[PDB]
C-alpha cells in the first residue's frame, strides 16, 4: 500500500543553497561539445595565485611607487596587510576573497623595479605583525621579518608575507580582524642610497603585484557587494 | 573547495521580478521600437546573467536614476552575484529556475520556450472563453499550487557551445552590434495566471525568478569588475 | 511681458560626454565667463550636467559664495559617458515647476551644449523634454561647441536663430541674458 | 614564448560545426605580418592602452598591417578558426624607464568609440593612446542598443566588456620592462563561443599594449621608442568557401 | 548517558524574539551609538549563547526593569537553558536554527551571513520596485511557506577554534573590552517578508528563533552560575 | 532522440475547457438534434485528438467567428499540438489525463466512462437529497481535494486496434458518415462538484482537461497540415 511518511517541519520550503537537485523539465538534450576550449577554470584559486597590480593613492590611483632620491629613515611605502584595504580592491586576491568570508594563506607581493638598467642599490622588505603603532624607522623595520632585495640579478622579488594569526582563518572584510589594529604592515624600505647613473632618469618606479601563495585557501561564500554596477 | 567553480555558482540567487500575464501576450518587438506599438512589456524573464533590456539581450546594463513619466520603463536584469565572481570569459551550465511568488496566495504558472524559439502569441476560443496559446505547447508549462513555488532544472539548450560572459564580436553586422551575443540564454520564462482572458483582473501581480547554475564549468580566465575608491 | 520679471533665472545645461572630451575646458571657460560677469545678486543660476545621469551639479541659488564653490566642481568634471540631453532638461523642468509654485512671473533661460550630437531616439526625448521645458515657461538657447549640425539644435531651441556657435556664444549671450535685464525690474 | 592555456597552441582539430573540408592552409603560412603602432612618449599617462583587434587589424590595416594573402583568404571563407601569435618589439634602451604590458585580451570591444560605432584610421592617429577613463573601467562604452522612441532610454552604468586596469596581468601577458627584455612573445590558441566563429565579425583576441609605468628619459638621450608588432595565425581552419566579401 | 555533553545540548530552545524586516535594513552601528542615527534596531539575531545587546556580542547580560520612554530599548538575548548547565569554558558545536513565526499565517524568509561578514544594506530597483539586496546572495536565504517554519543546520563557521563560554582576554585593546570575544558566533539571522518595499505594511511582525547545538563538544571544566538564597 | 515518437507525444497539453456539472446530467443527444431538447451541453470532454462537436466525434473541426445569439454554441475540441506533428495515419497510445481547475479553490471530481459505454443519467434520493448516479459506478470517479488536481493514466480501451488520425471509410452507412470513425476515443470525462443537487449553485464553473499520450506508437506515414502563404 502507501508508504506512511511523516513530513518534517520544513516542508514546502524553498531554501536557496539546498545541496540537492530538482525535477528535470526538458531532459534528453545533447549539448554541443566543449572539448575545443582551452583553459578550463576548475577552481577560482587558479586566479588568486596570478599576480595582479595593486593600487596606491599618491579615482586615478597608481600601481607603482615613485622612488625619491632623498635618503630617509621612514618607509618608502607602507600599506597594511588587510584584504579589505583599498590597496587590494582591484587585485585578484582582494577581489575574489572579498566575496568570501574567511581566508588562510600567504599573500605574495611580487615586486618589479622599473628603473634603468645600471641602477645599483638594496631594498629592505619588512613585514610586521599587528602592533599598536605602525613601524616607521628602519631600525623598527630590521627587528621584524625582513628580506634584503638588491638591484642585482633580482629586478623582481616575491616577498611571501607570512600567515601569523590567532585563528585558523581570518575575517576577510574587516578593518580590525584581530587585536587592536590593522593586521600587519608590509613596508618597502630603501637600505643603501640608490646609485642612479647620470643621463638615466632619476626617481625610478617600483611596480607592485599581489598574488596568493600555494597554500592560500578560502571559505564560506557570501553575497557579494553589488556596488560595482552603479 | 569552496572556491570550486562547480560549487560556487551552484546556489540560488535573484534574477528579475517580472509581472504575471493575465491575457494573451504580445512579445516585445525587437529594437528599435517606435512609439504607439501596442505590446506587453516586462512580462518575460530572459534567463541570462548578462544584462538585458525589454526581455532581450543587451550590451550594457542600465538602471533608472530619475524615472520620469515620458516613455515606457524597461525591465533591465543582471546577475549581481555572478559578475563580481565571474573572473572568466565562458560559462556553460545547466540552469535551475525557481519562481517565487510576490503576491499573497497567488496561483500562477510558469511557461518557457528555448533559446532561439519564440512565444506563441494568440488565443483560441474554448467554450466562448479566450484561452491563450501559452496554456499548451511542447515546452514545459509548470503549474503552481495556490501559494506554491515552481522549480525545474533547464538544460544548456542554446546553439552556442558556451555562454560568453565577455564577448567582443558582432552577432549581426557592425555599427552597435559589437559585444552583443545573440544565442547566450537558457531561454525565457513568463508567469501567467491559469484563468481565461475574460477573468482578467485589474491588479498587476508580480513574481520573482531565481536561478541556480547546476554543473558550472568556466573557461578562459579574465577580469573582475572595477571597484571605485569613493 | 508687460510686467517685469520679479525673479530672473539662468540654467547652464552642460554636456560632459565623451564627445566633449577635448573641449570641456572651452565649455568651463564659457560658463565662468558668464558666471563671474553677471555678479548681480538678483540672478539665481543653476549648473546642470549630463552624461548618463542628468545631474543638478548646483541647485537654483543666487549667492556668489555657493556659485564659486559650484565652479570648483565644474573645473574637475571629467568628461565621459553617453549624451542624455533629455535628462539635462528634466533637471531644469523639475526646477521650473518647483519655482512656478509662488505667484511671480519669472523667466528661465536654458543654455545647452553638444560637440557630438545625439542618437536618433536620444534626440526624440530631448525634443520632448525641451518641449516640456518650453511649456513651463522657459527660453532655450542651444550653444554649439565644435562641429555639429545647425538643423538638429534648432529643434531643441526656439528657432534656428537661438543656436549659436561657442566662439560667437559669449559674443551673443553677453547681450542676450542682458536683453531681459534691460526689460526686467 | 608565452604559450596560453596549453603546452602547444598549434594543436587544433577541425571544427565540428561544418560538413565540408576546411581550407587548412594558404599560400604563405610561415610568415609574419608586421604593422606599425603608435610611439610611446612621456605625455602618455598611466594605463593609457592601445588595442590591436585580431583579426580586426588585418581588415582595417591598423598601422600598415598588410595581411597579404591571409586577408584575401579570410575574405573568401565564412567561418575562420585560428590561434594567434603576436610579437611586440619596442627598442627600450638603457636610457629609458617604464614598463609596457603586452597582453592578448579575450573578447573585448576596445576599438569601439565610447560614443558610436567602430573607430576609423584617422581617429586612431588623432588620440594616439586611449586614456583609461571611467568609461573603459566600467565598460560604459561598449555600444548601447538603439531602444527606440517607445522605451525610455535607461541610464547605462555598466557593461561586461570593461577593463579592470589593475587586473590585466591575468591574461597571457609579458611585461616589456626597461631592463629585462625589449620584446615580448605571446602565442595563444583559438577560443570562442562556437567551435568556429565568423570571419568578418570576430574579435576573439585583442593585442593590448598598456603603459604601466610612464616613460621617462633624460633630455638629449634616446627619445621616444617606436612600437612594432607581428601577428601570425597558427593553424587556421577556414570553412564555408564563397566569393569575396562585399 | 543523559549527562552526555553531545546529548544534553542537542535539543531546541529559544534564543531571541526578533522583528521581521519589511524594507532594506540598516544594520545597527557599532558601540557607542550617538542619538539621531537612523537605523533598524532589534531585527537581527546574533546566534550565540553569550549575552548580546543590539545584535552585537555583549560582555554582560542586561534586561529592563522599568522601561521608560527616553531612549531606544535594546534586544538583549541569552541562552538561559545553556549557562545553567554550562559548567565549562569552551564549546564548539554545529548550530541548528529553527525560526518559528509568532504571527498568524505569516509568510516570512530567513537570511543569514557568517561569523565576521556583514549585512548587505541597500536596494536595487527591479521593475520600479525597491527590491533590497537581502533577497540575493551566496549565503542561505531560506524561504518559508505561508504559515511554515524555517529550519537548517549551520556549521561552525567562525575563525575562533571554539566559542569561549567564559573569556578573560581583550579582543581589541583594553579599557572596557575585557571579557568580550569578537568571533564567538555562528553568524546572524534576520527575518524578512519577501515583498518589495512599496508593499511595506504598518504592523510590526515578530518572529522567534530557536537553536539546537548539533555535535556538542565542551572543554575545560568550570563553574555554574550562583543561585541566591532568598 | 527528440524526434522519437514515444518521446515526442509523451507530454501534457490542453484539450478542452469543459464546464463542471452541478446536477444529474443529460448526455447530449446524437446528431441531428432538434430544438427544444432539454439537455446539458459542453459538460463532457471526449478524449480524442480528432475534432469533436457537442462531446461526440466530428468529421471536421469548426470554431466560431461571429458567435451571435440564435442557437446553442457547441464545445468543439482539437489537439493543436498533435496534428501539426502527426505525420502519420494510425496512433495507439495510453492516455494520461490531468484535470486542472480554472476556478479559485474549487473542489471538483472527475468521472469517466469507456469507449463505447455511456453516461448514467439519473438520480437516487439519498436522505431526501437528489444524489445523482455519477457518484457511483465501476468506472474511475477520482475525487479532488479543495484546490487540487486530478490525474490518472487511462488504457487503450477502444474496440478499434488503433486510432485513425486520418480515416476514409464510413462507420455507419454513407451520405455524410464518410471520414467519421466511431470507436476512436479513450472515453469521455466530465467534472462534477461532489454535492447533491439541492446545493446547486448559480455560477458556471469551468475546468480544463490536459492530455499526455503514454507509450505512443504511430503507423503509416502521411501528411502534415497545409501552412498558408499569407
Ligand atoms: Mg557625445
Question: SS3 letters for A159-197?
Answer: EECCCCCCCCCEECCCCCCCCCCCCCECCEEECCCCECC
Task: Find the largest Cα–Cα distance for chain A.
Answer: 96
Resolution (A): 3.1
Cα→Cα distances E173→A100, A176, C140, E50, E164, Å: 27, 11, 63, 20, 18
Phi first, then psi, for residue D18 (nearest 5°) are -155, 155
Spatial CB neighbours of C91, under 8 Å, sequence gap ≥ 6: C13, C46, C48, C50, C54, C55, C56
Q: Which residues of B touch E131 (CB under 8 A)?
A: 14, 17, 208
Tell me which chain A residue has its CA closest to the CA of residue F1: A28
Query: What is the distance in angstroms between the Cα of A21 and the nearest Cα belonging to chain D?
Result: 27
DSSP alpha helix (H) spans, A38-173: 45-48, 93-96, 138-142
Looking at chain E, which subunits does it touch, using at least 3 CB pairs closer than 8 Å as the criterion? A, B
**Distance set, CA E183 to CA A177, D107, E41 (Å):** 9, 43, 21
Q: With an 8 Å Cβ cutoff, is C36 touching chain B?
A: no
> In this complex, do B160 and D193 lie within 8 Å of one another by their Cβ atoms?
yes
Query: Would you say C84 and D140 are in contact if contact means Cβ atoms under 8 Å apart?
Result: no
Per DSSP, what are the bridge partners of residue B221? B88
Cell numbers given for A21: 537537485
User: E59 with E179: CB under 8 angstroms?
Assistant: yes
DSSP string, B98-118: EEEE-STT---EEEEE-TT--
- CA A129 from chain centre, in angstroms, equals 16
Q: Are the CB atoms for F51 and F78 separated by under 8 Å?
A: yes
Nearest-by-CA chain A residue for D140? A229
Count Cβ atoms below 10 Å from residue D157 Cβ, excluding itself. 19
As assigned by CATH, the class of the E1-230 domain is mainly beta
CA dist., res. B205 & res. E195, Å (int): 12
Please indicate whether, in this complex, the C-beta atoms of A39 and B13 are within 8 angstroms of each other.
no
**C84 alpha carbon – ligand 1 mean position (Å):** 9
Domains recognised in chain C with CATH numbers = 1-185 (3.40.50.410)
Rg (CA), chain D: 19
Technique used by the depositors: cryo-EM
Task: Round to whole Å and give the CA distance between D12 and B61.
Answer: 36
Cα gap F98→A169, rounded to integer Å: 55
Close Cβ partners of C65 (under 8 Å, ≥ 6 residues apart): none
Chains E and F touch (3+ CB pairs under 8 A): no
* β-strands A107-113, A158-160 pairing: antiparallel
CB within 8 Å: D4 and A39? yes
Q: How far apart are CA B85 and CA B87, in angstroms?
A: 6
| Three-class DSSP category at C122 | helix
H-helix or E-strand spanning residue C28 = helix C24-35
Burial of C65 (0-12, 13-18, 19+ CB in 10 A): exposed
Q: By three-state DSSP, how is residue C161 classified?
A: helix
B159: left (phi over 0), alpha (psi -120 to 50) or beta: alpha
Nearest to B80 among E128, E129, E136 (CB): E136
d(CA C43, CA B189): 56
Domain range summary for chain F, segments of one domain joined by +: 1-230
SS3 C21: coil
- Helices C85-99 and C120-135, axial angle in degrees (round to 10): 10
**Shortest Cα distance, chain D CAs vs residue A20, angstroms:** 29
Are B206 and B17 in contact by the 8 Å Cβ rule? The answer is yes
Q: Is the peptide bond before B32 cis (omega within 30 degrees of 0)?
A: yes
How many Cα neighbours within 13 Å face the side chain of A151? Answer: 24
What is the H or E stretch that residue C147 is in? Answer: none
Instruction: Answer whether F6 touches B (CB < 8 Å).
Output: no
CA B118 from centroid of its chain's CA atoms: 13
Say which DSSP state E30 is in.
P
The domain spans of chain D are 1-246
Chain B residues whose CB is inside 8 A of the A228 CB are: 83-84, 225-228
Grid cell for residue C25: 575646458
With a CB cutoff of 8 Å and minimum separation 6, the contacts of D185 are: D1, D2, D87, D174
CA of C120 to the centre of ligand 1 (A): 13
Comparing alpha-carbon positions, the chain D residue that sits nearest to B59 is D144
Q: Give yes or no for a cis peptide into F106 (omega within 30° of 0).
A: no
Cα→Cα distances E153→A10, B169, E49, E93, E193, Å:
12, 47, 16, 11, 22
**How remote is the C-alpha of D229 from its chain's centroid?**
10
Whose CA is closest to F106, among F55, F143, F134? F143
Contact D146, D64 (CB under 8 A): no
> How many Cα atoms sit within 13 Å of C16 on the Cβ side?
28
How many Å lie between the alpha carbon of B150 and the closest alpha carbon of chain D?
A: 30
Cα separation, B170 vs D88, whole angstroms: 27
How many cross-chain Cβ pairs, A to E, lie less than 8 Å apart?
Answer: 101
In b/e form, how buried is each residue of B11-32, taking b as 16+ CB within 10 angstroms? bbbbbbbbbbbbbbbebbeebe
With CB atoms and an 8 Å threshold, state whether B13 touches E126. no
Q: How many Cβ atoms sit within 10 Å of the Cβ of residue A40?
A: 16
Task: Flag if D115 and C53 touch (Cβ within 8 Å).
Answer: no
Report helix, strand or coil for D78. strand
Q: Which residues of E169-190 are buried (b: 16+ CB within 10 A; e: fewer)?
A: ebbeeeeeeeebbbbbbbbbbb
CB count within 10 Å of CB D183 equals 16
Q: What's the rounded Cα separation, in Å, for the pair E121 and E25?
A: 6
Length, in residues, of chain C: 185
Q: Is C17 annotated as a binding residue?
A: yes
Query: What gap in Å lies between CA D80 and CA D60, rounded to an integer?
Result: 17
Give alpha helix (H) positions in B73-162.
80-83
CA distances from A165 to E161, E182, F53 (A): 12, 14, 81
Q: D1-246 in CATH: which number?
A: 2.60.120.20
- Expressed in angstroms, the distance from the first to the final Cα of chain B is 33
- With contact defined as beta carbons under 8 Å apart, do C64 and C49 qualify? no
**How many other CB atoms are there within 10 angstroms of residue E102's CB atom?**
12
Q: Breaks in chain E follow which residues, C to N over 2.5 Å?
A: none
Contact B124 F17 (CB under 8 A): no
Interchain proximity C120–B66, CB inside 8 Å: no
Q: Distance (Å, rounded) from C-alpha C135 to C-alpha C148?
A: 26
The answer to whether B52 and B76 have CB atoms below 8 angstroms apart is yes
Residue B176 host element (H or E): none
Scan for cell 572568466, then name that residue: B88
Task: Identify which of A22, A91, A86 has the alpha carbon closest to the alpha carbon of residue A53.
Answer: A91
Residues after which chain A is discontinuous, using a C–N cutoff of 2.5 Å: 58
- What sign does the CA torsion over E155, E161, E165, E170 have? negative
The partner residues of F126 in beta bridges, in order of sequence, read F129
C19 is in an annotated binding site: yes
Q: How far is the CA of D55 from the centre of ligand 1 (A)?
A: 28
| Set of cell numbers at residue F21 | 456539472
Cα nearest neighbour of E148 on chain A? A10
CA of F210 to the centre of ligand 1 (A): 56
Q: Give F-chain residues touching A29 at CB under 8 angstroms.
A: 2
What is the spatial distance between Cα D51 and Cα D210, in angstroms, rounded to a whole number?
A: 8
Distance C15 CA to ligand 1 centre (A): 8
Cβ atoms of B45 and B189 closer than 8 Å: yes
The span from the CA of F1 to the CA of E106, in Å, is 47
Long-range pairs for F57-63: beta carbons < 8 A, 24 or more residues apart: F57/F180, F57/F181, F57/F182, F57/F184, F57/F185, F58/F180, F59/F176, F59/F178, F59/F179, F59/F180, F63/B124, F63/B125
Q: Do chains F and C touch (3 or more CB pairs under 8 A)?
A: no
Separation of CA D134 and ligand 1 centre (Å): 15
Helix locations, C100-168, DSSP H: 120-135, 150-156
Handedness of CA C13, C85, C92, C79 (dihedral sign): negative
Question: The C-alpha cell of D173 is what?
Answer: 601577458
* DSSP assignments along E69-118, one per residue: SSS--------HHHHTT--EEEEEEEEEEEEEE-STT---EEEEE-TT--
CB F10 within 8 A of CB F214: yes
Q: Are F29 and F156 in contact (CB under 8 A)?
A: no
**Beta-bridge partners for B72:** D151
Is B99 within 8 Å of B18 (Cβ atoms)?
Answer: no
DSSP annotation of E170 reads B
Closest chain D residue by Cα to residue B70: D152
CB nearest E161 (choices: A9, A167, A226): A167
Measured in angstroms, the CA of B174 and the nearest CA of chain E are apart by: 31
Q: State in Å: Cα C80 to ligand 1 middle.
A: 9
Taking the Cβ of residue C170 and every Cβ of chain B, the question of whether any pair is shorter than 8 Å is answered with: no
Cβ atoms of D212 and A209 within 8 Å: the answer is no
Question: Cβ of D146 and C19 within 8 Å?
Answer: no
Q: How far apart are CA E118 and CA E138, in angstroms?
A: 13
Please say whether the dihedral angle defined by the alpha carbons of residues F13, F14, F15 and F20, taken in this order, is positive or negative.
Answer: positive
B165 three-state secondary structure = coil
C44 in contact with B, Cβ within 8 Å: no
Q: Please report which helix (H) or strand (E) contains residue D126, including its range.
A: helix D123-126
**Number of residues assigned to chain D:** 246
Cβ pair B84:A41 closer than 8 A: no
Joined grid coordinates for residue A18: 539546498
Residues in Cβ contact with E71 at an 8 Å cutoff, skipping those fewer than 6 apart: none
Chain F from 168 to 227: CB within 8 A of any B CB: 206, 208
E140 interaction partners in chain A (CB closer than 8 Å): 15-17
Q: Are B179 and B47 in contact (CB under 8 A)?
A: no
Can you give the three-state secondary structure of chain F, one letter per residue? CCCCHHHHCCCCEEEEEEEEECCCCCCCCCCCCCCCCCCCCCCEEECCCCCEECCEECCCCCCCCCCCCCCCCCCCCCCHHHHCCCCEEEEEEEEEEEEEECCCCCCCEEEEECCCCCCCCCEEEECCEEEECCCCCCCCCEECCCCCCEEEEECCCCCCCCEECCCCCECCCCCCCECCCCCCCCCEEEEECCCCHHHCCCCCCEEEEEEEEEEEEEEEECCCCCCCCC
Q: In A, which residues are within 8 Å of D191 by CB distance?
A: 37-38
Give the integer Cα–Cα distance in Å for D173 and D169: 6
Contacts of D119 in chain C (CB under 8 A): none
What are the Cα distances from residue C3, in Å, to C66, C135, C151?
30, 20, 34
Cross-chain Cβ contact D153/C121 below 8 Å: yes
| Class at the top of the CATH hierarchy for domain A1-230 | mainly beta
CB contact under 8 A, B3 and A29: no
Rounded Cα–Cα distance for residues F21 and F23 (Å): 6
Between helix C64-74 and helix C24-35 the angle, nearest 10°, is 170
What is the Cα Rg of chain B in Å?
18
Distance of CA A32 to the CA centre of its chain: 38
Q: In what order do the strands lie in the sheet with D2-3?
A: D2-3, D186-187, D85-86
Q: How far apart are CA F43 and CA F28, in angstroms?
A: 9
Angstroms from B124 CA to nearest CA on chain A:
25
Residue B186 and residue B91 in contact, taking contact as beta carbons nearer than 8 Å: no
Is the Cα torsion angle C12, C15, C20, C22 positive or negative in sign?
Answer: positive
* Number of other residues whose CB lies within 10 A of the CB of residue F189: 26
Contacts with F103 (C-beta within 8 Å, 6 or more apart), sequence order: F20, F205, F206, F207
Bridge partners of B109?
B143
Closest CA to A41 of F67, E94, B220: B220
> CB-hemisphere CA count at 13 Å for B122?
5
Handedness of CA A42, A45, A51, A53 (dihedral sign): positive
Burial of C103 (0-12, 13-18, 19+ CB in 10 A): exposed
Amino acid at each position: 500500500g502507501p508508504i506512511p511518511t511523516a513530513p518534517r517541519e520544513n516542508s514546502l520550503m524553498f531554501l536557496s543553497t539546498t545541496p540537492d537537485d530538482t525535477v528535470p523539465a526538458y531532459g534528453n538534450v545533447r549539448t554541443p561539445p566543449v572539448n575545443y576550449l582551452p583553459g578550463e577554470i576548475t577552481d577560482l584559486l587558479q586566479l588568486a595565485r596570478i599576480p595582479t597590480l595593486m593600487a596606491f593613492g599618491r579615482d586615478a590611483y597608481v600601481p607603482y611607487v615613485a622612488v625619491p632620491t632623498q635618503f630617509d629613515d621612514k618607509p618608502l611605502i607602507s600599506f597594511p596587510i588587510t584584504l579589505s584595504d583599498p590597496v587590494y580592491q582591484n587585485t585578484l586576491v582582494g577581489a575574489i576573497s572579498s566575496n568570501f568570508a574567511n581566508y588562510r594563506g600567504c599573500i605574495q607581493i611580487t615586486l618589479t623595479f622599473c628603473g634603468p638598467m645600471m641602477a645599483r642599490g638594496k631594498f629592505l622588505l619588512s613585514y610586521s605583525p599587528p602592533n599598536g603603532t605602525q613601524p616607521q624607522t628602519l631600525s623598527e623595520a630590521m627587528q621584524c621579518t625582513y628580506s634584503i632585495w638588491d638591484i642585482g640579478l633580482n629586478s623582481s622579488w616575491t616577498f611571501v608575507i607570512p600567515y601569523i594569526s590567532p585563528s585558523d582563518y581570518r575575517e576577510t572584510r574587516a578593518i580590525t580582524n584581530s587585536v587592536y589594529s590593522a593586521d600587519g604592515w608590509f613596508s618597502l624600505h630603501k637600505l643603501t642610497k640608490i646609485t642612479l647613473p647620470p643621463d638615466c632618469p632619476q626617481s625610478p618606479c617600483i611596480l607592485f603585484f599581489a598574488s596568493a601563495g600555494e597554500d592560500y585557501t578560502l571559505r564560506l561564500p557570501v553575497d557579494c557587494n553589488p556596488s560595482y554596477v552603479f | 573547495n569552496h572556491t570550486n567553480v562547480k560549487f560556487l555558482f551552484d546556489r540560488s540567487r535573484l534574477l528579475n521580478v517580472i509581472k504575471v500575464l493575465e491575457k494573451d501576450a504580445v512579445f516585445p518587438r525587437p529594437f528599435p521600437t517606435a512609439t504607439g506599438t501596442q505590446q506587453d512589456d516586462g512580462y518575460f524573464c530572459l534567463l541570462t546573467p548578462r544584462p538585458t533590456v525589454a526581455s532581450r539581450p543587451a550590451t550594457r546594463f542600465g538602471l533608472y536614476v530619475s524615472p520620469s513619466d515620458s516613455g515606457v520603463l524597461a525591465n533591465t536584469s543582471l546577475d549581481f552575484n555572478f559578475y563580481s565572481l565571474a573572473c572568466f570569459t565562458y560559462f556553460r551550465s545547466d540552469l535551475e529556475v525557481t519562481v517565487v511568488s510576490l503576491e499573497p496566495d497567488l496561483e500562477f504558472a510558469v511557461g518557457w520556450f528555448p533559446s532561439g524559439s519564440e512565444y506563441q502569441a494568440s488565443s483560441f476560443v474554448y467554450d466562448q472563453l479566450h484561452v491563450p496559446y501559452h496554456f499548451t505547447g511542447r515546452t514545459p508549462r509548470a503549474f503552481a499550487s495556490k501559494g506554491g513555488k515552481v522549480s525545474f532544472v533547464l538544460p544548456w539548450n542554446s546553439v552556442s557551445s558556451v555562454l560568453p560572459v565577455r564577448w567582443g564580436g558582432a552577432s549581426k553586422l557592425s555599427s552597435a552590434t559589437r559585444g552583443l551575443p545573440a544565442h547566450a540564454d537558457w531561454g525565457t520564462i513568463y508567469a501567467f495566471i491559469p484563468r481565461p482572458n475574460e477573468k482578467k483582473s485589474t491588479a498587476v501581480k508580480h513574481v520573482a525568478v531565481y536561478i541556480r547554475y547546476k554543473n558550472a564549468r568556466a573557461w578562459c580566465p579574465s577580469m573582475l569588475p572595477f571597484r571605485s575608491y569613493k | 511681458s508687460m510686467a517685469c520679471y520679479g525673479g530672473f533665472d539662468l540654467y547652464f545645461i552642460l554636456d560632459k560626454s565623451g564627445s566633449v572630451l577635448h573641449h570641456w575646458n572651452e565649455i568651463y571657460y564659457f560658463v565662468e565667463q558668464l558666471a563671474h560677469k553677471f555678479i548681480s545678486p538678483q540672478l539665481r543660476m543653476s549648473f546642470i550636467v549630463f552624461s548618463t545621469r542628468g545631474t543638478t551639479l548646483m541647485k537654483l541659488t543666487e549667492d556668489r559664495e555657493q556659485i564659486r564653490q559650484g565652479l570648483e566642481e565644474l573645473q574637475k568634471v571629467l568628461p565621459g559617458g553617453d549624451t542624455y540631453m533629455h535628462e539635462g532638461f528634466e533637471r531644469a523642468s523639475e526646477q521650473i515647476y518647483y519655482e512656478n509654485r509662488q505667484g511671480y512671473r519669472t523667466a528661465s533661460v536654458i543654455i545647452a551644449l553638444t560637440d557630438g550630437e545625439l542618437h536618433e531616439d536620444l534626440f526624440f526625448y530631448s525634443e520632448r523634454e525641451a518641449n516640456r521645458s518650453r511649456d513651463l515657461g522657459a527660453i532655450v538657447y542651444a550653444v554649439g561647441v565644435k562641429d555639429f549640425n545647425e538643423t538638429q539644435l534648432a529643434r531643441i531651441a526656439d528657432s534656428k536663430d537661438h543656436v549659436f556657435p561657442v566662439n560667437d556664444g559669449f559674443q551673443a549671450l553677453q547681450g542676450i541674458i542682458h536683453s531681459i535685464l534691460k526689460k526686467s525690474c | 614564448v608565452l604559450c596560453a592555456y596549453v603546452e602547444d597552441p598549434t594543436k587544433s582539430d577541425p571544427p565540428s560545426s561544418s560538413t565540408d573540408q576546411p581550407t587548412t592552409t594558404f599560400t604563405a603560412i610561415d610568415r609574419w605580418y608586421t604593422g606599425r603602432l603608435n610611439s610611446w612618449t612621456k605625455a602618455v599617462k598611466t594605463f593609457s592602452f592601445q588595442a590591436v583587434p585580431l583579426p580586426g587589424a588585418f581588415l582595417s590595416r591598423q598601422g600598415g598591417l598588410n595581411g597579404g594573402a591571409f586577408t584575401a583568404t579570410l575574405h573568401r571563407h565564412f567561418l575562420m578558426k585560428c590561434g594567434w601569435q603576436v610579437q611586440v618589439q619596442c627598442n627600450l634602451t638603457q636610457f629609458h624607464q617604464g614598463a609596457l604590458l603586452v597582453a592578448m585580451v579575450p573578447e573585448t570591444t576596445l576599438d569601439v568609440k565610447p560614443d558610436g560605432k567602430a573607430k576609423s584610421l584617422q581617429e586612431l592617429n588623432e588620440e594616439q593612446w586611449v586614456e583609461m577613463s571611467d568609461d573603459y573601467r566600467t565598460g560604459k562604452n561598449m555600444p548601447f542598443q538603439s531602444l527606440g522612441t517607445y522605451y525610455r532610454p535607461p541610464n547605462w552604468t555598466w557593461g561586461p566588456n570593461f577593463i579592470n586596469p589593475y587586473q590585466v596581468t591575468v591574461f597571457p601577458h609579458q611585461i616589456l620592462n626597461a631592463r629585462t627584455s625589449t620584446s615580448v612573445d605571446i602565442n595563444v590558441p583559438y577560443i570562442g563561443e562556437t567551435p568556429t566563429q565568423s570571419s568578418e565579425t570576430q574579435n576573439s583576441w585583442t593585442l593590448l599594449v598598456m603603459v604601466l609605468v610612464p616613460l621617462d628619459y633624460k633630455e638629449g638621450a634616446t627619445t621616444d621608442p617606436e612600437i612594432t608588432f607581428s601577428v601570425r595565425p597558427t593553424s587556421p581552419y577556414f570553412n564555408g568557401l564563397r566569393n569575396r566579401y562585399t
